[PDB]
């Protein structure tokens, strides 16, 4: 999450040339021929002391910045100091106002390398407004700053600053009509970003109330019938065709963490004839190499581990009257799987002691899972939901 | 997580080459994901790839393995990942829709 | 909240060359070296009634 | 997109949740503790004055 003057892609890379040139200035009239050794991308302008320059940023999505970067390096290996990368905010009569600064003198380095410093405070920003990210470099000892820029056409609109004057580069409060002769006086464009780097984290939740026409292009569908997957009908999930096998369906979102909480309501279940293995699933691989898995029958509960292909089952429990709103979650800090049945323990625990569950980036998606067999469909699913509770 | 071979529909013409994975991957916004093309042919016709010209002093970003062995590996270490990165001097242009 | 054909910032901005080019028509033969005075940018397209 | 006829945003927490979230720009003046959601409900994090 960050914002840029124009793609980061362009200071990172080039353009192979090609053609023929034109005519000459002087000499036999000749027209040399283009290739891959023309390489078109940016340029760098030398900047002394005083002298201010920066750009425009564009806000796409509204977040809280943290640092700002800049494309830059010292000409000479002498020591530097007074490099200050500054934010400014343009408010509607267009007047910058400092929001933010911060000195990068110390960390600069001789070769040309990205230049990211983190601001004092985060600083709210949001869609529609323009931001200008500004390097000033008032150093003491003399040592110029070469920042990498673009050139930009005559003809177009002007969105970059420049100062020279002493007084305009500690300026922290641009009034319009500096801002416009600013605008004039500048030829460059300079490369900035504003970024995102570390977010507070939400614990992002999920649900479904399975109440619509098709399955939908929320759920990844991964069957052994081969072509019949998760099918939804009168508003609940279902094993769609008269095949034997089983249909598992993954939720796209991932959550935030390790600690899971799935719960679903079972319907139709206590109608099963025999073997019908239904329910929800949790910790499961993009690729379900490994998941653990709840199935609920109309004569008990087993908890079960590993792939698709062949589960292993860790738990049991016989209970009765499997047509209610089931619940199970995991907590990491005993490493323990829970369910919980109609807000009722129903004692059905799992413990991780040999660790056969490995929690990760990549084992954080949920779904549902049904199974048919012998002429007769297992139960149908409603309310999924996935979360990560406190 | 995902393989396919598109040398039967491939053209002499410089033209796009979309291929089917065998089966859907899911991605979601901030991973990375890497398009390889390895060219491990027994003929021996050689293949030209649209890339865009790096310069140096940036982010490496791409990767380039020149060794039978490495180009036919499957899980990659990230010891070799930096090395193909340091390697690479080209960036290929890669699309998944 | 704008659609465009490609970004504005080309139809704004140029690039700078440079490196060295190749091998002449005629004459003696050398290589011009590129520089800044060099934009790389879009073109413009006369058009009749 | 030049002109649009603006609604009027409006937004709604219930606070239940694990951490606070990015969705919310925290200040204090204890230094390192700030509004903190516990039981479901937001409150001041730490014991500090």
């Given at each position: 999450?960050?914002?840029?003057?124009?793609?980061?892609?362009?200071?990172?890379?080039?353009?192979?040339?090609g053609g023929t040139t034109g005519a000459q200035?002087?000499?036999?009239?000749?027209?040399?021929?283009?290739?891959?050794?023309?390489?078109?991308?940016?340029?760098?302008?030398?900047?002394?002391?005083?002298?201010?320059?920066?750009?425009?940023?564009?806000?796409?999505?509204?977040?809280?910045?943290?640092?700002?970067a800049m494309k830059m390096y010292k000409e000479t290996s002498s020591a530097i100091n007074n490099v200050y990368?500054?934010?400014?905010?343009?408010?509607?009569?267009?007047?910058?106002?400092?929001v933010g600064s911060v000195d990068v003198s110390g960390q600069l380095t001789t070769a040309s390398d990205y230049v990211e410093?983190?601001?004092?405070?985060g600083v709210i920003v949001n869609a529609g407004e323009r931001y200008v990210v500004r390097?000033?470099?008032?150093?003491?000892?003399?040592?110029?700053?070469?920042?990498?820029?673009?050139?930009?056409?005559?003809?177009?609109?002007?969105?970059?600053?420049?100062?020279?004057?002493?007084?305009?580069?500690?300026?922290?409060?641009?009034?319009?009509?500096?801002?416009?002769?600013?605008?004039?006086?500048?030829?460059?464009?300079?490369?900035?970003?504003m970024a995102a780097k570390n977010l507070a984290t939400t614990d992002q939740s999920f649900s479904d109330d399975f109440n619509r026409s098709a399955m939908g292009g929320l759920w990844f569908l991964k069957s052994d019938t081969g072509t019949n997957q998760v099918g939804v009908s009168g508003g609940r999930a279902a094993f769609?065709?008269?095949?034997?096998?089983?249909?598992?369906?993954?939720?796209?979102?991932?959550?935030?963490?390790?600690?899971?909480?799935?719960?679903?309501?079972?319907?139709?279940?206590?109608?099963?004839?025999?073997?019908?293995?239904?329910?929800?699933?949790?910790?499961?691989?993009?690729d379900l190499s490994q998941v653990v898995y709840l199935?609920?029958?109309?004569?008990?509960?087993?908890?079960?581990?590993?792939?698709?292909?062949?589960?292993?089952?860790?738990?049991?429990?016989?209970?009765?009257?499997?047509?209610?709103?089931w619940q199970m979650y995991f907590d990491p800090a005993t490493a323990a799987y829970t369910v919980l049945k109609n807000g009722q323990a129903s004692g059905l625990t799992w413990t991780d002691s040999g660790s056969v569950v490995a929690h990760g980036p990549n084992y954080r998606f949920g779904g549902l899972r049904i199974s048919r067999a012998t002429f007769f469909n297992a139960g149908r699913i409603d309310n999924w939901t996935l979360k990560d509770w406190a």
């Open positions: 999450t960050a914002f840029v003057t124009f793609p980061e892609m362009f200071c990172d890379w080039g353009f192979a040339l200035s002087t000499g036999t009239a000749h027209t040399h021929t283009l290739n891959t050794d023309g390489l078109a991308a940016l340029q760098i302008q030398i900047l002394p002391a005083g002298y201010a320059i920066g750009g425009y940023i564009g806000i796409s999505d509204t977040t809280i910045v943290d640092t700002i990368l500054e934010v400014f905010r343009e408010d509607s009569t267009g007047a910058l106002t400092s410093a983190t601001l004092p405070a390097m000033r470099n008032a150093t003491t000892v003399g040592n110029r700053v070469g920042v990498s820029v673009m050139k930009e056409l005559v003809g177009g609109r002007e969105l970059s600053i420049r100062t020279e004057t002493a007084t305009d580069s500690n300026k922290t409060f641009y009034t319009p009509s500096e801002v416009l002769t600013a605008q004039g006086v500048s030829v460059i464009m300079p490369w900035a970003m769609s065709g008269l095949t034997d096998g089983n249909q598992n369906a993954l939720y796209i979102r991932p959550t935030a963490g390790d600690k899971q909480w799935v719960e679903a309501t079972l319907y139709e279940t206590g109608i099963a004839a025999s073997g019908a293995r239904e329910g929800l699933l949790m910790h499961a691989n993009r199935g609920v029958n109309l004569n008990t509960a087993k908890i079960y581990t590993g792939p698709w292909n062949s589960l292993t089952e860790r738990a049991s429990v016989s209970t009765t009257g499997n047509d209610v709103l």
